[PDB]
Every structure is written in C-alpha cells, then in structure tokens.
Design a protein around this ligand. Sequence first.
Ligand SMILES: CC(=O)Nc1nnc(S(N)(=O)=O)s1
Length: 283
Amino acid sequence: TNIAVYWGQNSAGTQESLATYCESSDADIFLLSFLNQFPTLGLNFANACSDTFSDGLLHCTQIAEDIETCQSLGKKVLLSLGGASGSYLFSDDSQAETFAQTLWDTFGEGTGASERPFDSAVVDGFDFDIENNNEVGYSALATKLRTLFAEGTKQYYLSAAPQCPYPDASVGDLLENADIDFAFIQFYNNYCSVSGQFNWDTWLTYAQTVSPNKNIKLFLGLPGSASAAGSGYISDTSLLESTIADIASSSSFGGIALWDASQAFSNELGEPYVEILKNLLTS
Ligand SMILES: CC(=O)Nc1nnc(S(N)(=O)=O)s1
C-alpha cells in the first residue's frame, strides 16, 4: 500500500519543491496539479513555476529536475489533468484521441517535436481529476494512451480522482470503460466522507465487478489538514486506524491519497499528518 499526494496548488501556502516531498519518505506517488487547460495546453503550479515559452506555456526546469530526482528515489510522478475550476473540455472522442498523442509527445516518451514543459523529464503517467461534470472523451483518451505507452521504456500509470458519490459525474464513464491503475476517491466535501455515510463498500463493488481492470487499486482520498477542504478532515487517529482496518482487508485497497502535500506535510498532530498515515498503513 502507498500514500499518494497531490502537489502543485499550494493549498497550505507553504508549499516546498516537489523534490523536498519526494525526499521525505512519507509519500510514494506524486500527482502534479495541474494541467488545468486543454486541448490548448495550459499548466499551473502556483509559485513553483513561472517561466514560460514565448507562447505562454509554462516551462518548469526545477520541476523537471525534481521529477527525475523523485524517480531516482523510487517514486511515481503523474501529471494530473483538470482540477476544480480551470478550463478544459473535449468536444468528442476523436478530439480526445488526438490529445493522447499530444500528451505522449509533450510529457511522455513520444518523439514528436513539440514544446516540453519538463524538458527531458518524463512523467510516469496521468491522473484524471476531472471536476466539471462533463465526461466526454476521457475513456477514449485513456484507451489511446495505453496503446502509445507500448512505445515507451517503463511502465506507465493512469488514475482517476472521482469524488465519493457513485457514480462520479465527471470520471464515471472513464472508470467504467477504460483500464485504470488507481482511483483516488475524494472522501471529502461530500456526504459519503468517513464520518458521513462512508461508501467504500460501493467502490469495492465497482472494483470487483465493473472496472475493466479487475486489479484496480482504490485509495482513501483525504484532506491533509483542517484547512485543506470544507469538510471531511479526520484528526481522530482511532477512527483512521479502524477505517484502515476495515478497508485494508481486500486486494483492491491501494492506500491513502491526500489533498495536498503542502497541507499533509505541515499539518502536525507533533508529527506530520502524512507520517501518521504512512505509519498506520505499514501496520
Ligand atoms: C483531487 C482534488 O482534491 N482536486 C482538487 N482540485 N482543486 C482543488 S481546490 N478547490 O482545493 O483548489 S482540490
């Protein structure tokens, strides 16, 4: 089991470099937040990158260096598409399939000469954090990416970030119709959070019975601090322990995901929140 953390949007204000969190040993998977504009490419990583190519697209040499450092240390670094707010849509499947090629050539191991925000660094795949209630294109995009990944020289990963209500109005189709490695389910800002009417059991049925990938790994997505989300933050370590005990008893359990790194690393409970969770997973 693994800890995934979103990084890039500086929820806490005190966000450190990506490599700083990779070097902490409290997290395993890093989701760069976000490619918030597409098909016409646009990235945003708050204070962590501000230089651009002449045409306005972010050019991020420090993030590039840090992606490589993270990977050397055994971490997986995915590019997260979308995010709450932000400016994106596919008109249809054909447009989304074209966009698979664009992602491969821009961020992956594709050889098509185009501007690369991370220079020679190569992401380990993509997270679909679609939050606009429009599901067009993503299944097609995911499926096309899988075909392109065969050209690469390492394993690539695709993940999605549904909110806990099932089915998810943005990535539900993606999750039902494409092969997905990880579902980082947001158990926050919603009725189905851990202290609400927690609906892990529904997500488990989805994993065993609906997901094209029967080996999909489901993650308990949580806010990293009281200030990381409106509702859903858990500070009761007993509840965390028992929650983990309940859900870790299947092969479908992948670990915990956190919004976001700046929050989970700085929020102390006098030990970082991310450390508390990493440690509960280990047992
Ligand atoms: C997976 C996830 O939590 N994604 C988010 N995107 N934007 C967020 S926001 N409203 O806190 O800035 S959270």
